[PDB]
Design a protein around this nucleic acid. Structure first.
Lengths: 205, 151, 262
RNA sequence: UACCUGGUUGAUCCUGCCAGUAGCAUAUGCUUGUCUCAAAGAUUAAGCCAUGCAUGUCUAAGUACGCACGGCCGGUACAGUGAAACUGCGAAUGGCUCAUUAAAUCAGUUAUGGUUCCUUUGGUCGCUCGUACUUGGAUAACUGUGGUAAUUCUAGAGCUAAUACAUGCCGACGGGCGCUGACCCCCUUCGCGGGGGGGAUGCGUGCAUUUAUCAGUGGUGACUCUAGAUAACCUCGGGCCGAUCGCACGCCGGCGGCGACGACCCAUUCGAACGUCUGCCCUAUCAACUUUCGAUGGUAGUCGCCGUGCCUACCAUGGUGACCACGGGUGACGGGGAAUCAGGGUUCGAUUCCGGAGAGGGAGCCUGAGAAACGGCUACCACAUCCAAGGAAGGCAGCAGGCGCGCAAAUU
RNA sequence: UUAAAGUUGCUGCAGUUAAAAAGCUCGUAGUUGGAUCUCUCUCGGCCGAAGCGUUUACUUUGAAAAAAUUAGAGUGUUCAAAGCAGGCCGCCUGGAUACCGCAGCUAGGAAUAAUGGAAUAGGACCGCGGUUCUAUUUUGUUG
RNA sequence: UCGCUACUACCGAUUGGAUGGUUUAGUGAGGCCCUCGGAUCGGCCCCGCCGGGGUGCCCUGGCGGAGCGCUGA
């Protein structure tokens, strides 16, 4: 029953308007269906023109983009760590746009060790199971043994990312509006944005 | 840090600022490329729009607005908000019976970009029409000429 | 209202249809089609009012329902189909062919044309865009989209459409010295050579035109239709040659043309 | 046709008002032979409503097993005409009225580079590499059995369709393009080494969707545009990639020609919406207002067709005001226009065209391209109809007509 | 209700005695204000672009301004108010045009009226030197 | 200065009654959205009575039953 008209306000001078019609249908607004963390549940809406809006109520996965490596994989959303509008939305674990989430780094770890042949996020004791020994210590051909070592020089990672790879949980920021498209996509936090939101979460407590 | 005064991260959204570099990139220079664009009606983009560090999504030289419609003017009266000023336009209204005019005025709230820094009240400013930026703001400051009592 | 209007009052009709005051409350209300409803002549007005073939708005139904009427080479069974500028009306049971061109006074005209000319029409290019795996398109003023155009076709030019196939044969570009017809405004239906085109960026281009007698006029750019390359029209012209007579000499023509009688 | 005339004193010249005079509009009186056009329940009561009508719809081309007719010929799936009912579409227009409403509506002028658009017209529709010579279950009309005082109320039982509801291939199809990549080959090097080709194996491939990154065919006055490339996603309340009907009949078991319905997306048409600039009557016995509860602005989002305090969180303390804000009034819907008029003006504009609003008063929805719809639904407040007292149904500011009101307005 | 009403007055009234100048003065807003000042650079085929100059008001032209109404052209409705018809012996016609304030576009004029332009010269025009960033052509391609 | 008849309006006891408009507080029909709920309606199973085909086993046709089976509406 919400109405997002402009005529229920005061004028710029401060005078109140006497209205000249009743609430029209194109002025409507619908309730906020806040997207929580759970197994997927979307409910389609019928909007103007007969089109569809995917009003998501629970979401569990969403594909994110490691920007500096051109790697887009579908991860598992874990948590909400910080929301820069309201902080009661963090204790309610609501997924909105531009909220910082914890994702699962395991699809990116499998891409990194497949593309660069370097162990990422392993402990110092380095218990290396044989099923990934064949991708970390493979048998290379004559032209491939130089190609992998040619890739291996610039295969460095900023150390703020590797501490997240140690525990398996990356920081990500949602860039799509889940209550309107039904998806929770986004990107992985890298660099200056990462060390901004890190100290925001640290000073939050 | 001189930009990030907010609670979310101020970032120019078109520019990717996490490109991977090599040892001549980390030792050479920490270079943030900036996004600027040309307003198409013969308004020069200021050098502050090309050299600044401000972030503004409603700046007509660096943000996401396009100037279309009427291009107008007015003089500054009150600069007491965040990034927006109040200009008053003065005009004469012809009364037909008396064959005479009368002084009239109307105010406009108008967005002032941070590239136009050191603007004092009482100088002529060109404004340009865009989409609604807030409840009362629909024009954007395009060039600032100074009052004749300057030097 | 709530949703679109389906009626047209008679006094609210376009002036150039020349509907009288006392025949009804309503006017024919053109169907949606290629043309704006202010810029068109419905097929009921061309048959009943102009040509005097029909006598009522039921005989236009009885004529169009025998499929006797082709508008741009396709048979039209809507009596309020908006025929507009440069549209070819082929009636094959009688043997006539018409083209809708404006005359000097801002209306349309019964312009009978030869069936050797009725195989083509001109269109004006309105927007050119690429898309769909990099394939270029036109959009003309009839909403005809002709993908794969010539790369030297740009906006505001004139193509020549073959009406049996739909394809472009050859074109004219927007330049000075080209023969143009004005299709809107107070200089509507006037034919002259493009003299000059003044640019107003962020507003409308003004295109100064020169007559074949020396009478210069101007329009906005959107009321300009390039008809010929140089001074030779690629279509035929009406009985008057697109040259507007002032009312004094328009009177002199009548009071001297009655003196040929006896 | 740029006009005056009687009235103050014993008489005079003035100020000055009363009175006449001429239109034009509402009423009304008396009178009224012909003929042509023509307004007409606006004003008071946006008061109240008996009765009837004002919105429906089939082509060759969605569904025919009604003998309801008749018709070949009687094994001939369906000759035909066709009520009914399912399906589709419309009912959002037109008509009526003027209660609201004073920067609001509206008019001119621009904008959508900030959005949706049934339809029409043009485009596109083997562009995707992975039972089909045809898929599945119901349901009306119909038959048959009932309930209730009562309604365009419906319940149960038995059949049967689809362009309703669903599910779902083949074909094009041979490949191609990107990642991978055992292996093989070639050149050079004594050799190591360096460089270049071919390649089985697995993975992903279109166009729409959502995110991120790269480079810079066509465009604008200016795009964060249009296209291109790369990595992924693609909603079970699913996104396209046709299980459809007709008419003439065929060409060498295949290959067919004209249509009708569909259909995502693009364009167009018809619009709608939200904005820009300028403009309106009376009042100061209305001079300060707005800001807890959004007032002005900033940041992040929510919602919404989209731009925005539209809304929420955190901030900043602003925004309008003698150039008359704010408040009140209007015997105010606004214009196009109408009366009068030397020139200037003044007053009217409910009323047939454009735009707004509203269907007794507020409010909320369903369906749909489009409605906050009232000849749709759900409530509440106000009236009010039937009743067997348990219930049921309402909305004339549509056309007629009635009552009431009134100085004041036509035919069921 | 309009004219008459120059009895609302901008045109165009009145204010000593007929109704009426504030007791006097200062004063912000408003309103009004004295003389004065005679188009060029980089390109295309001498002719077009692009720039102006300090910004406007004014004036003239243009284009855009719904139809109906109003004005007005044509036409013997039997005249007229109307209408958009008609006319000739199948043809020939018409269905024009003006007006459409203020605001907004456009182009010419430069009188009037507002406004700038250097006065502790961080002033104009010249060629001289320095500091910082940096174009993308140059070296048969290639770093 | 001082005598008769009536109207207009206000005060006007009566804490006379009835109804509007602004708000204080409390209450809150009905729709929509969310989280549940699950009356009923299928489907797939499993056995039992059994045919045919292929070769004790698989697929088919009629049913019947049971299960807090496991799914859809």
């Amino acid at each position: 029953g919400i109405s997002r008209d402009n005529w229920h306000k005061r004028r710029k001078t401060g005078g109140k308007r006497k209205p000249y019609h009743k609430k029209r249908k194109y002025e409507l607004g619908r309730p906020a269906a806040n997207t929580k963390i759970g197994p997927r549940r979307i409910h389609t809406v019928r909007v103007r023109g007969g089109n569809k809006k995917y009003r998501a109520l629970r979401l569990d996965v969403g594909n994110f983009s490691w920007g500096s490596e051109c790697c887009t994989r579908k991860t598992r959303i874990i948590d909400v760590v910080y929301n820069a509008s309201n902080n009661e939305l963090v204790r309610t674990k609501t997924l909105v746009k531009n909220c910082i989430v914890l994702i699962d780094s395991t699809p990116y770890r499998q891409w990194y060790e497949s593309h660069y042949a370097l162990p990422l996020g392993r402990k110092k004791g380095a218990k290396l199971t044989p099923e990934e020994e064949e991708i970390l210590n493979k048998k290379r051909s004559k032209k491939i043994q130089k190609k992998y070592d040619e890739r291996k020089k610039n295969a460095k990672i900023s150390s703020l990312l590797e501490e997240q790879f140690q525990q398996g949980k990356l920081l990500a920021c949602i860039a799509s509006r889940p209550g309107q498209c039904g998806r929770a996509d986004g990107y992985v936090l890298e660099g200056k944005e990462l060390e901004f939101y890190l100290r925001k979460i640290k000073a939050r407590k | 840090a001189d930009i990030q005064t907010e609670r979310a991260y101020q970032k120019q959204p078109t520019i990717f600022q996490n490109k991977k570099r090599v040892l001549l990139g980390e030792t050479g220079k920490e270079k943030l490329p900036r996004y600027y664009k040309n307003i198409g009606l013969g308004f020069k983009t200021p050098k502050e729009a090309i050299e600044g560090t401000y972030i503004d999504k409603k700046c007509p030289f660096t943000g996401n607005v396009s100037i279309r419609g009427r291009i107008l003017s007015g003089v500054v009266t009150k600069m007491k908000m965040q990034r927006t000023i109040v200009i008053r336009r003065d005009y004469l209204h012809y009364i037909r019976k008396y064959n005479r005019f009368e002084k009239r005025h109307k105010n406009m709230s108008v967005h002032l970009s941070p590239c136009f820094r050191d603007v004092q009240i009482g100088d002529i400013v060109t404004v340009g029409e865009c989409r609604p930026l807030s409840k009362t703001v629909r024009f954007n400051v395009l060039k600032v000429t100074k009052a004749a009592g300057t030097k | 209202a709530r949703g679109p209007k389906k009626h047209l009052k008679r006094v609210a009709a376009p002036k150039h249809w020349m509907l009288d005051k006392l025949t009804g409350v309503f006017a024919p209300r053109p169907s949606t089609g290629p043309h704006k409803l202010r810029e068109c002549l419905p097929l009921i007005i061309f048959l009943r009012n102009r040509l005097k073939y029909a006598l009522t708005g039921d005989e236009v139904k009885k004529i169009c329902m025998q499929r006797f009427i082709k508008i741009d080479g396709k048979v039209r069974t809507d009596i309020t189909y908006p025929a507009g500028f440069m549209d070819v009306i082929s009636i094959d049971k009688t043997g006539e062919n018409f083209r809708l061109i404006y005359d000097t006074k801002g209306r349309f005209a019964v312009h009978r044309i030869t069936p050797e000319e009725a195989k083509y029409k001109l269109c004006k290019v309105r927007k050119i865009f690429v898309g769909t795996k990099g394939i270029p398109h036109l959009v003309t003023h009839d909403a005809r989209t002709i993908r794969y155009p010539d790369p030297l076709i740009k906006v505001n030019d004139t193509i020549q459409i073959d009406l049996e196939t739909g394809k472009i044969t050859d074109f004219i570009k927007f330049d000075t010295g080209n023969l143009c017809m004005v299709t809107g405004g107070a200089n509507l239906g006037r034919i002259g050579v493009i003299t000059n085109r003044e640019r107003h960026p962020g507003s409308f281009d003004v295109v100064h035109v020169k007559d074949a007698n020396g009478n210069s006029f101007a329009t906005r750019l959107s009321n300009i239709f390039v008809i010929g390359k140089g001074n030779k029209p690629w279509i035929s012209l009406p009985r008057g040659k697109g040259i507007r007579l002032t009312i004094a000499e328009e009177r002199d023509k009548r009071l001297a043309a009655k003196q040929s009688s006896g």
